[PDB]
Symmetry: D2
Subunit: 386 residues, 4 copies
Amino acid sequence: KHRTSLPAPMFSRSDFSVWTILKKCVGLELSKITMPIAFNEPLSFLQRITEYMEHVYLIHRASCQPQPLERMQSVAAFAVSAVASQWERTGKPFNPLLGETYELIREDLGFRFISEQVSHHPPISAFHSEGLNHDFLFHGSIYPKLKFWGKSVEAEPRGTITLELLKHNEAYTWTNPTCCVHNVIIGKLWIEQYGTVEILNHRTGHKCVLHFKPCGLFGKELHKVEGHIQDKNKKKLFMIYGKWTECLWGIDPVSYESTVQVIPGSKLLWRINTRPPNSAQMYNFTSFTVSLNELETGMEKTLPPTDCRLRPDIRGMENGNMDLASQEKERLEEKQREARRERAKEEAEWQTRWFYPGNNPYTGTPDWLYAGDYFERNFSDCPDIY
Amino acid sequence: KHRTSLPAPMFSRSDFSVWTILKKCVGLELSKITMPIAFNEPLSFLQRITEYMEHVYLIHRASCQPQPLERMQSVAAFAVSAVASQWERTGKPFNPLLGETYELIREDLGFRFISEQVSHHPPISAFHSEGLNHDFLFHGSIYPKLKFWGKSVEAEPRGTITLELLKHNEAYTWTNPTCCVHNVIIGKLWIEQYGTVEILNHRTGHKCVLHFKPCGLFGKELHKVEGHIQDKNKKKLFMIYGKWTECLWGIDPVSYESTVQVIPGSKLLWRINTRPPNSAQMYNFTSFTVSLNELETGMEKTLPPTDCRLRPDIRGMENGNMDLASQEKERLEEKQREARRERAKEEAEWQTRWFYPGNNPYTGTPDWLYAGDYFERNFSDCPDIY
Amino acid sequence: KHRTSLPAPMFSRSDFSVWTILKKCVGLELSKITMPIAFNEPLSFLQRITEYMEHVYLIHRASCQPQPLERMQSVAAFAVSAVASQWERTGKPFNPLLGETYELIREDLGFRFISEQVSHHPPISAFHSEGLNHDFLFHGSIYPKLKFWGKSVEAEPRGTITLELLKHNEAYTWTNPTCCVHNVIIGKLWIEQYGTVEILNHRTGHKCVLHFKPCGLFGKELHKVEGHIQDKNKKKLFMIYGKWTECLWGIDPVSYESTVQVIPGSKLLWRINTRPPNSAQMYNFTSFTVSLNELETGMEKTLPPTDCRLRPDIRGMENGNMDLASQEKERLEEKQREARRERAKEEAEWQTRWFYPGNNPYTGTPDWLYAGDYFERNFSDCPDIY
Amino acid sequence: KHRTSLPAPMFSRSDFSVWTILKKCVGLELSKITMPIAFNEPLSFLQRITEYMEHVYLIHRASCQPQPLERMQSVAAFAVSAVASQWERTGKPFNPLLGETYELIREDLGFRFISEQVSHHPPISAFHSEGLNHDFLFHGSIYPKLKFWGKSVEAEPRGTITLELLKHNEAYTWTNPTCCVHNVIIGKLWIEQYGTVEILNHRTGHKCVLHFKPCGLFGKELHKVEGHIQDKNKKKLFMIYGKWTECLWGIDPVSYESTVQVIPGSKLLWRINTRPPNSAQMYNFTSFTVSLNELETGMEKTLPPTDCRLRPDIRGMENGNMDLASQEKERLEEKQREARRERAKEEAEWQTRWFYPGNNPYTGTPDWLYAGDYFERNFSDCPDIY
Ligand SMILES: CCCCC/C=C/C/C=C/C/C=C/C/C=C/CCCC(=O)O[C@@H](COC(=O)CCCCCCCCCCCCCCCCC)COP(=O)(O)O[C@@H]1[C@H](O)[C@H](O)[C@H](OP(=O)(O)O)[C@@H](OP(=O)(O)O)[C@H]1O
Ligand SMILES: CCCCC/C=C/C/C=C/C/C=C/C/C=C/CCCC(=O)O[C@@H](COC(=O)CCCCCCCCCCCCCCCCC)COP(=O)(O)O[C@@H]1[C@H](O)[C@H](O)[C@H](OP(=O)(O)O)[C@@H](OP(=O)(O)O)[C@H]1O
Ligand SMILES: CCCCC/C=C/C/C=C/C/C=C/C/C=C/CCCC(=O)O[C@@H](COC(=O)CCCCCCCCCCCCCCCCC)COP(=O)(O)O[C@@H]1[C@H](O)[C@H](O)[C@H](OP(=O)(O)O)[C@@H](OP(=O)(O)O)[C@H]1O
Ligand SMILES: CCCCC/C=C/C/C=C/C/C=C/C/C=C/CCCC(=O)O[C@@H](COC(=O)CCCCCCCCCCCCCCCCC)COP(=O)(O)O[C@@H]1[C@H](O)[C@H](O)[C@H](OP(=O)(O)O)[C@@H](OP(=O)(O)O)[C@H]1O
């Protein structure tokens, strides 16, 4: 009736994987497959998150708007502006060590920033930023899930972003879209962003939906962003459109019915900053990106021993010495693996210095909350990671 | 104030990718990176979808239940049973050629099946199956998105599954969870399934939510499935729990409050079939899997020229000759690439023989609908793919 | 005048090799680069040397010739016949373990053979064979120096071959030509032999010069052998010509002046044996090659524990199980490396069981002489290598 | 009796090589395996030969000695000095294109030099140098046969070196020893030289034998050179000893019987030049090596279009731009392969511009003789290779 077996037995009745194939078929026995330093950029991922604050003026602008509709327009413009720096940025930020931290104080911009690499398996980065004029709280946690297949590498920054406007007693939450790096095998590396972003005003019911459109057939929808701002009863109040690599516009639904085409009567929500001319000769950094890993004058007395400005492999790549930056990275990672074994032979879990596990008080999703008192600078009992 | 440049220029001011690194650093210039045949299994992905019909008795059982609650219990058991065959199945089914088809008629099981490889970039497989006693319609489309990173390969079978119970004038829709293949680099290849499945009864409002739990820390939640069946007003009517590698149980919410632990008063929704003893020596096939690629007596007169039973590379691997199966696969793929160029130089799009693009009439999601009249067997104007 | 420096410093002022390039540029860190078992053949190199005895009838023929001229004709035919088995033999014999031995007794052919793997760094194989009728002694040592570049792999069997004709009180010495394996990268693997061989009769002054011609432009000289036999005063007495893959002819210098063209009046010195029809399905073995690794009935009681008939990885490949033959080879080599470390931590040199270092008593070249008393079979104090 | 077959058929009855294994087992299909530019040095092999003239003062010294014994002492010192520059030189000179040339005129040293890359398959470099005071002719041809196995790469500079002392009407011929580059896989790259060199005075019968000793067990014979100068009747007249990385001494055989130990009464034949302090930061070049690829002021009017000072890939590496030097090398080689195809489709052989095939008039060995009239600079009808 129906056959019960295959004509011949399996060609190889052995447990075979990649490492087994390389050992038996070719002569290569492998001991480690890691990320070569060439694909990196002189930048910690903790500092990559700090680039969200480049457009902090949109938070200042949202904090001084009277009504919730105009605040969401600036909150949506800020969330879109946070991903704009990825354009032509094909270098991968360094995977930060467990216990790594980064602080940034900018009096001229009205915020102080603190981030900590809170986990390694999986890599989790918790960040907190508060306004220096009692205006906003900006915090969250990022698990960057990298996925690769074909010609492209997807990077999904999983985690909840939280923006708390103090002077209005409200909070916004959303998630960043997926970043895609094409032509990683052959061709010119180029960046794309797609996904759906939903910003929720947790005391007014306002919700802003943003569709980062993937480039369709032949790429006619490249970088296009289209969305809307609805109220609590799903009534659309505002139409949003543009490109995250250029500008973001807004218009009322009445005029909506009546190479970004710009409808008359629309108002600008955000426009991308022009990059400095030395950007391409600088890993495509922005002006705000170069200031991130700068060791300020007299900063040796205030920084904790876990600030990535002290990290040598990033500093070595920044100075152009790949030879020792590759060896320092290998030295730092072996020390991190070595420190893990000792923490396992004594059955002791790793302690986070500045953030603690908890639930986001607006969505219930597990999050990494800021514990406070980082800037009183009690920097004993810190990890020795460098 | 803040520095405006990096101390040294970029180490390499050249557009570098993987192919460039291999060419300049090592001596290897590459022309093609494809999937080696060793990781494959003597099975088309069109036939991999046909394994959903192994537990068609659960559809027969659901079709003869009077009330919608008991039908959803068998529909949920059927959807869970469709993924059960993945256990210890670490071989990859062949990527079917554009225009490839597969039919399966089983009078003893009460269904006839037809699938067609409707696209190649991206790979899309449309399938349709109807009951031989005017009882059920089972169709859908699958885009298997493979994603790899670290030690594991994720496979997300994107697409909407549709089950139409004719004698009850209702339809169910859901999506299959993500399959994960661990230890693809080194170690023992093993399978896991996680995600959230939602089955929707489109005329009663009944919704069954199923959580394929990922194995947590140390793997205490391995293969566990937990869910519930709620009515139109989100009132939970039934509690579901078990393992997709063993059995699936059900219980009412009253007794719920009052190594699968089995609560007294629960009833079995589904139990996995035992595999034949020659399974491990058979690419871990089930009894239903071996019958898929069998060329029946006299089948040469009814099959179309695009049925994967006629496909030579699968047949060569099935007979144990990797040498010609690898060459036949390379021959078939070059012919498919060659056929694409001619279709491009004449500016002619590819025509699908048995399925057509459309919208699913229950969710509005773009789908691939069955056009009918496959089994009248008018097999001229078919593609020449072998 | 003349510049004293280069315009720019070195691109990389680091000590870089192959292992460093793979680690820094690609993600691969290597721990071992060895010979994959696919290129091997079910045959120890100790048994590869035993194939010299396939044409022992030419030694029997030389031993029963009255005059030294006709004996050199058969000694030259024997030396040429020893390399004839390489034709279409592109599999590499197993690198024998330190202390490995191989014996072959053939009463029907009139010789008993013994070989021992006397060194590993470098690999040296010493062999001795004596006639069972007090007629000849045949011994020597082989260091196979493998050299690779481009498309081909050269194999130079360094070492002095010694043939002692007892009933004539004379000895012959010579060296085998270089074997070349073409198209090891891409194309069809094929064998070639080139070099100059000089056979010296140590009590008559007779010298036979043989030129294994390399295939010239377009390969018109493929496999051609041309030489002569001169007396003590360099007077040429005999002309030799033919192909080592077919036949070897001889003619006097008078008729020489007056697709092997065969001059009338020439006489055949040697003709190659026809291979059995199952040769190509047998790693291109000869009939004499298959009998080498055969475990005779009752041979378990006479063999030493170091005879490669007991070697499991060769036996596993011979039975068609590459899976365990590759693992047994890896197991045997680790044990050999492990045994070397213990011999180093106790500052003890390795002892050879059956051969001892010495000088060849006919050329003064360092050689490996046979110590005798192998066939009294005192097989305690043998190495444990398997 | 003796078995006639193997228990199981061959594991793979397919023609398999390296390229086939990589394609079937791994996913890599290769199209070209070449030498990566990292292992190179800013230096053509034609210029590598010119470094023989660094110690031309030893030829001047030999030309002004009255007796043949003292001339051979300086000829032997010159031949040893020609290989001394290899110490710590682990970079490979560029493989020169077919038709490439290099000239060097040094009035202050008393010679003009000309070399031409006379072949490509195999690579052959013919060089000629004559004294500017009618004193010496120095010419020859070099086929550098590179052979690799294990941890080391051997380089045998095959070819006959010829030194003609005009004012004494005699000629010397010899061959350079084999160069070995250890630890090319892992470890520190270091250089060794071994072999036997025989210098023959073709009108006096004087012969100087030089043994470049390979480093023995633990390397106690590293770089040691030991030899002697015998007359026509093999009577040893002079004893030579030292290291080719330091100094070379000489002593009469009487005092010979009666960390280089220096016997009292010995006289210095040659001492190595000290390298400039910037040598290690200069690919370990000597002072004479940097002047080789220098484009002199006004040299644009006298050089032929085939002088490697005009070669761009060497110039690009010399300026520190590996990016375009690798692309220029790939561009130059494709043009050379392209030029070969056209020369084949018209059935036209390649013409050598300045050297012609012939026999060395002192040994009869096939050589490449200098045709003269290079320095009349009739540089039309030259190849277009750049
Ligand atoms: C343009 C980019 C292509 C190269 C991909 C770049 C590959 C990544 C390169 C990594 C560096 C060196 C590789 C060394 C690793 C050895 C493993 C080789 C695996 C293979 O390498 O990796 C893939 C791309 O997926 C990757 O990520 C695979 C990542 C796997 C990493 C190791 C994991 C184990 C290997 C396989 C996993 C087995 C588990 C699967 C089980 C799942 C079900 C249970 C080949 O792709 P695929 O299977 O989809 O093959 C198409 C197809 O053959 C089609 O038919 C097109 O045909 P068509 O368009 O001509 O019509 C083609 O097009 P094309 O190559 O001409 O461009 C081409 O795309
Ligand atoms: C157990 C499996 C590990 C091997 C991964 C297996 C890798 C796949 C093997 C393919 C076959 C041969 C590879 C040939 C291809 C050459 C490219 C090499 C890329 C690399 O190979 O691929 C990865 C795994 O992601 C892969 O898929 C990468 C796929 C990329 C394919 C080619 C695409 C271009 C290459 C990079 C893309 C650059 C674009 C990125 C841009 C994104 C932002 C804009 C290394 O991983 P990673 O970056 O996360 O490195 C950790 C880390 O170093 C950690 O620190 C742990 O440290 P720790 O646990 O010791 O604490 C470690 O652990 P471990 O290795 O000891 O196990 C280890 O996991
Ligand atoms: C047909 C076979 C070619 C492939 C060789 C096959 C290479 C072996 C394959 C091994 C498996 C995978 C390789 C992975 C190892 C990475 C190292 C890559 C080194 C390279 O791979 O290895 C060679 C062949 O020498 C080998 O053995 C090298 C063995 C080295 C092994 C590792 C040792 C370190 C690497 C270099 C040593 C550096 C030390 C040198 C110092 C000496 C002086 C002090 C390329 O050859 P080469 O330098 O002579 O390059 C010509 C040339 O470029 C010409 O110009 C023709 O040009 P043309 O005829 O077109 O006119 C071309 O012809 P073609 O390739 O089109 O056929 C082609 O032959
Ligand atoms: C230190 C350097 C070792 C790595 C060699 C470096 C290898 C070159 C690396 C190239 C770059 C990447 C390789 C990719 C190419 C794939 C082919 C792999 C072939 C293999 O790779 O290449 C060799 C070294 O010969 C090479 O040149 C081979 C060049 C071949 C190139 C491609 C040609 C086809 C491949 C094989 C040719 C088949 C034809 C043979 C036929 C001849 C007879 C008719 C392994 O050596 P081998 O056979 O002698 O193996 C010993 C042994 O296993 C011993 O037993 C020691 O044992 P023990 O000392 O522990 O006692 C060990 O010692 P160790 O490795 O621990 O150091 C170790 O040396």
